Amino acid sequence: ANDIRDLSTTEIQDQEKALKEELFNLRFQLATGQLENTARIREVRKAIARMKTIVRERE
């Protein structure tokens, strides 16, 4: 969370994209019954929310 604040906005924006790609893949593996560590999904969702919160704070 503080580590996110060390990054630039553009750098944060890139981290979001990466997390959204990850979240999509998790949901895809979950659907095909190949996930196992199902707790990752919640982690990633929160992370994305954290990014978007920091960015909105910047403005």
Add this chain to the structure above:
RNA sequence: UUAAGUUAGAAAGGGCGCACGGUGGAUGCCUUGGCACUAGGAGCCGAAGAAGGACGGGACUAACACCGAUAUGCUUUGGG
């Protein structure tokens, strides 16, 4: 033996009493909820989009509660 006479007993089923069960949810005890007030506070919300909703959000989610595509939560300050 015959005759005359007398009287018993009987239960297909039923009645009364008793015993033991079933059904049913009265009664007692209990209280998650109510009822009436007192003292203080507060007496408005809305185009900066209200009241009230609909549909969604969880690993799996039918319902409730919570939340809004940042969705079963995000940041921060304190408490613990």
